[PDB]
Amino acid sequence: DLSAASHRIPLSDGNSIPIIGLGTYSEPKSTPKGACATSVKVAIDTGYRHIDGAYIYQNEHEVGEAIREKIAEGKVRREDIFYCGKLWATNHVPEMVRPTLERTLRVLQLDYVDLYIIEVPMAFKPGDEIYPRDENGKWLYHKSNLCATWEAMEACKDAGLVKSLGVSNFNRRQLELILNKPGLKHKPVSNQVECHPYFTQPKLLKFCQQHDIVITAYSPLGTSRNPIWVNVSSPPLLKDALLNSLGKRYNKTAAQIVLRFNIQRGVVVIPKSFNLERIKENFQIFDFSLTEEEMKDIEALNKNVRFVELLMWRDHPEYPFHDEY
Ligand SMILES: NC(=O)c1ccc[n+]([C@@H]2O[C@H](COP(=O)([O-])OP(=O)(O)OC[C@H]3O[C@@H](n4cnc5c(N)ncnc54)[C@H](OP(=O)(O)O)[C@@H]3O)[C@@H](O)[C@H]2O)c1
Ligand SMILES: C[C@]12CC[C@H]3[C@@H](CCC4=CC(=O)CC[C@@]43C)[C@@H]1CC[C@@H]2O
Numbered sequence: 087d088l089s090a091a092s093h094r095i096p097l098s099d100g101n102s103i104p105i106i107g108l109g110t111y112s113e114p115k116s117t118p119k120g121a122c123a124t125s126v127k128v129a130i131d132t133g134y135r136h137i138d139g140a141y142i143y144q145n146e147h148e149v150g151e152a153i154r155e156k157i158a159e160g161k162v163r164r165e166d167i168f169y170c171g172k173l174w175a176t177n178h179v180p181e182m183v184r185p186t187l188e189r190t191l192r193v194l195q196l197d198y199v200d201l202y203i204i205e206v207p208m209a210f211k212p213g214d215e216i217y218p219r220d221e222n223g224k225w226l227y228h229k230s231n232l233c234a235t236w237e238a239m240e241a242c243k244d245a246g247l248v249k250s251l252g253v254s255n256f257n258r259r260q261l262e263l264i265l266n267k268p269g270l271k272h273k274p275v276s277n278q279v280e281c282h283p284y285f286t287q288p289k290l291l292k293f294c295q296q297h298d299i300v301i302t303a304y305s306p307l308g309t310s311r312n313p314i315w316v317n318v319s320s321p322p323l324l325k326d327a328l329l330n331s332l333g334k335r336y337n338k339t340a341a342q343i344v345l346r347f348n349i350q351r352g353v354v355v356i357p358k359s360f361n362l363e364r365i366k367e368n369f370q371i372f373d374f375s376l377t378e379e380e381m382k383d384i385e386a387l388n389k390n391v392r393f394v395e396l397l398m399w400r401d402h403p404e405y406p407f408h409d410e411y
Contacts, residue, residue, distance in 0.1 A: 088349060090133045090372050095352060097275040098298035101250045103201070104168055105349045106369060107136025109304070109358030113312070114144045117360070125360040126152035130161060132369050138278075138302075138356040140172040140205060141190050142216050150194035169194070170278075170302075172205035172254060173239070176212050178230060183238035187247055202242065203252040203278055206396075207232060207260045207404040230404045236264050240271045252276030254304070255396070257406040258293050265297060278302040280394050281353055282344055283387040284323055289411040291353070303348050306355040307341050307368075309393050316393045323393075328383060336374050339367060346371045347384045 094102040108129040110122055122145040126137055130152070139149045153169065156162050171194075177186040187202055211218040211226035218226035242248050252274045253261070264274055277294055281287050281303030294301050308323025309316050323329070329340040336343070341357070345368055348355045359365045376384070392407065399405055 088372050090369070093349075093372065094135075095300065095354070097250055097300060098273060099250055099275050101200070101275070103250075103276070103300065103302075103354055104134070104136035105352075105354050106134065106345065106371065107138045107168065107170070107354070107356040108134050108365065109356040110137060110139045110145060110149060111143045111358055112145065112360060113310075117145075120148065121360045123148035123152045125362075125365060127156060128362050129365050129369075130156045130167075132366050134365075134369060135162070135166055136168040136170070136354075136356070138170045138304075140174070141186075141193065142172070142174045142205070146171070146190060146193045150196060154195060164196070168200040169196070170201040170203065170252075171199045172203050173235075174205045174216060175208050175210040176216060176218065176228075178204070178209040178228065178235045179212055180231075180234045180238040182212060183235060184242050184245070184247070187242050191247060198246060199248050201250045201252055201276060202239065202248040203254045203274075203276065204232070204235060204239065204256070206255045206399075207253075207257075207406055208399055208402040209235075209404070225399065225402075227402055232260060232263050232404070233267050236267065243272050250275045252278065252299075252302075254278035254302075255406050257409045258290065258411050259409060260404065260406060261293070261297070261299070273297070274299060276300050276302050276354075278304050278356075280305050280392050281348060282306050282308055282323055283326070283329065283347060283384045284308065284389045285392050286385050286388040287411070288385075288388065291351075293411065300352070300354060302354040302356060304356060305394060306348055307344060307357050310358075311393075315396075317395075320391070320393060326387065328387060332376070332380060332384070338370075338374065341368060342371055343376070343384070346374065346376055347381065350376055350381060
């Protein structure tokens, strides 16, 4: 099926998405300047045709630098590259949506993005702070209105500034709010959520499939395990015994088995690496396949326990992870 040369899958709006992309979140204070640009360049040279980014990762200008350089030298055409950008919580006021996308286009120095998604379902205080809180450390929230935010997203598509619209960290209820919208013009085509053999999202995946929504697996290797966002008492995904033993069987690493697992089930994966060797390793997933028995055994690792619980926002009206899916 999938090959290095050819591994795009269809989206419900007629576009397509490369089933592996390069994730680009990196700790801003702990990351050298230019590491993102270089990594994007190396990934494109390796064969990646999808890059996942966000203004709030603080490096979208490096993403643009790299994509633009590779287009200028003729490695790829604009049409061959799929960039996904994200609308952060402080920018959900409908009047703010298109100017926020427009800023990302200017930062990238590109005419459109391939996919633009609502980054989380919660709205925070519009400001010059990504994570607004009072001196008391209390979180500065904003009342959400996902339907009105979505309408503003639709207008960006109508204007030609984005090919496909989608969402992230949305549960079934939140998806239905959009999908049941009176006057819905553009259905979401993607939901970007945590997904990997310890959290396989079986119900949310089946629900998305019911609506022709493709899941994009963020943290598909189990995260960088920063103690701020992940419980580092949870066992590291890449130390799993089955994943390592299947790696031995195929002379592949646990990482490669995890990535192959999700793509083989039609789940897009966006592993992040800023390491040239691991960027290449993570793309070498088209020269083997897992047997159905293997696939079953890996899905069986599903703990229905997430690494990314976002516990600091659990009180927000739109907190997505109280519901079972
Ligand atoms: N929409 C959202 O809410 C959301 C939230 C979180 C993440 N995401 C997106 O999804 C991307 C992926 O997730 P993530 O960055 O959290 O995590 P991840 O991709 O699951 O894991 C990345 C961690 O794994 C290391 N790594 C990469 N390849 C490896 C390999 N072959 N073997 C061993 N270690 C490897 C990386 O270090 P090196 O760089 O040194 O290789 C990094 O520390 C993000 O960068 C972002 O684009 C979206
Ligand atoms: C992107 C983000 C900050 C970075 C977080 C991400 C959740 C997952 C996470 C796992 C880590 O180990 C590193 C930090 C990251 C990558 C958060 C979700 C919303 C917040 O803005």
